[PDB]
Amino acid sequence: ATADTSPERLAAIAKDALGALNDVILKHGVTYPEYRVFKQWLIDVGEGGEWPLFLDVFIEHSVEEVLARSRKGTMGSIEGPYYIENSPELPSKCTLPMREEDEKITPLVFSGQVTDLDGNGLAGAKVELWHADNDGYYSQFAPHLPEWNLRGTIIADEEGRYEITTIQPAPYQIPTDGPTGQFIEAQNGHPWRPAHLHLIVSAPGKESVTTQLYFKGGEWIDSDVASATKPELILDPKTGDDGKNYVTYNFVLDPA
Amino acid sequence: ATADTSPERLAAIAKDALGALNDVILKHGVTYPEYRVFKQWLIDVGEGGEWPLFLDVFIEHSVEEVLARSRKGTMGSIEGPYYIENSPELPSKCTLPMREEDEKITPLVFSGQVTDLDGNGLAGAKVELWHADNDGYYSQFAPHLPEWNLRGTIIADEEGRYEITTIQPAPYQIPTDGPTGQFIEAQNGHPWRPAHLHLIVSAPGKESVTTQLYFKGGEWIDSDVASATKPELILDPKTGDDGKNYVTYNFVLDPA
Ligand SMILES: [Cl-]
Ligand SMILES: [Cl-]
Ligand SMILES: [Cl-]
Ligand SMILES: [Cl-]
Ligand SMILES: [Cl-]
Ligand SMILES: [Cl-]
Ligand SMILES: [Fe+3]
Ligand SMILES: [Fe+3]
Ligand SMILES: [Mg+2]
Ligand SMILES: [Mg+2]
């Protein structure tokens, strides 16, 4: 990981970041016992391998909010910690890899088109999709799961269209066995995200968009622990007589 | 490490701490590349075992500033990361353990009395002292050094008086081989503390004081990387015809 940040820029960021934390300590009268706890908790986060989790839950949303200023296309959201590159490519109309267990869940049929800002459909567009199963697990983050379970890179058609069947996502509880759970527990917080799809949508000569999609009336939409839900990203799927949920959502890309 | 902090209190601290960092990201337009760097750097701090160093250098001073509000006695300062409990007890007039190498350095003869707020001398008072050698090393934090080099707990006399000989401390460069050094390097900062003694001064029925003492006209006093120097804690030792530096400093304790 590299960035082009100048010494001057880092100096300024570091000054107000530290200034800000030091201001919080002064405001609340943080005590030595509390300082000692905080020190050990930071150590524990690293030893538990939880930096990606903690940062993606409590910090990334502000980083996307910065990126969001520069963008006219479909709203972005956090990547979160569970993305895997090079998920196997699938045809424009497809179902994601899943287990026999997953086949017991109500299907979600997700259709739409990738377009530019004027509404023109894009060819060569890809839709990388990943999400949790009904048990609350991500493939590659649960040793029982086939490595691409509920993961794929969908090659859109010459018009930019896709029709992707998956399972209906359910709410996701973040790992609570470690320091991040402990941080949440200690303040009577809620360790839950709403049900969500993760997507990265790309196309030749376009700025990719990393986003998420949520479900109308879903649990936790108004109290997402990661602060990553946006009203523009809430889907309202319709149930057909086959008992499957159907929704269309188009992606709009900014130029690269 | 435990603290008595309520869920309500942690909730509030966490809210403005995170709010504050998120505000800094928004102010400066922190980018995804920069976020990725920050994530890896946090990981590196833990893997390098540098949480105590980083926090004591960049954060502890605000924690002492909180404690300072409650105190009328001699000014405190940060403990920093190098304190060791149960250093061997020494008589009221003593020299700290040192090596033949240390005996090559100009002596510092440090005298005074431990008193209450009215100026009354205290019996049963102890002065725990530790500091770096002229090479920039702390005992127990450098495998070549005898474990109590430049460390001792001085038992003051029935009047609270002490006369402690040590070596004249020299400026201290913080470890720069790791992520903390890298943080400093990346912003064209200075990885230096002024020359300093560390002391913890205690007595029956008194609140102990953890403090530091610095040296008039010393390098880095105005630009201490740890932000821990205070004008009240600057010593002005006088050189005698024996070529030794002499200084008196009295400690004043608040009641427990
Ligand atoms: Cl700073
Ligand atoms: Cl591609
Ligand atoms: Cl409805
Ligand atoms: Cl919060
Ligand atoms: Cl004692
Ligand atoms: Cl002078
Ligand atoms: Fe997720
Ligand atoms: Fe020191
Ligand atoms: Mg237009
Ligand atoms: Mg008085």
Swiss-Prot record, chains A, B:
InterPro entries: 1_2-CTD_multi_dom, Catechol_dOase_N, Cchol_dOase_actb, Chlorcchol_dOase, Intradiol_dOase_C, Intradiol_dOase_core, Intradiol_RC_Dioxygenase
Organism: Rhodococcus opacus
EC numbers, comma separated: 1.13.11.1
UniProt-listed Pfam families: Dioxygenase_C, Dioxygenase_N
Protein family: Belongs to the intradiol ring-cleavage dioxygenase family.
Protein name: Catechol 1,2-dioxygenase
EC supergroup of this enzyme: oxidoreductase
Cofactor binding, per record: Binds 1 Fe(3+) ion per subunit.
Transmembrane annotation, as ranges: none
Catalytic activity line of the entry: catechol + O2 = cis,cis-muconate + 2 H(+)
Domain of life: Bacteria
Cofactor: Fe(3+)
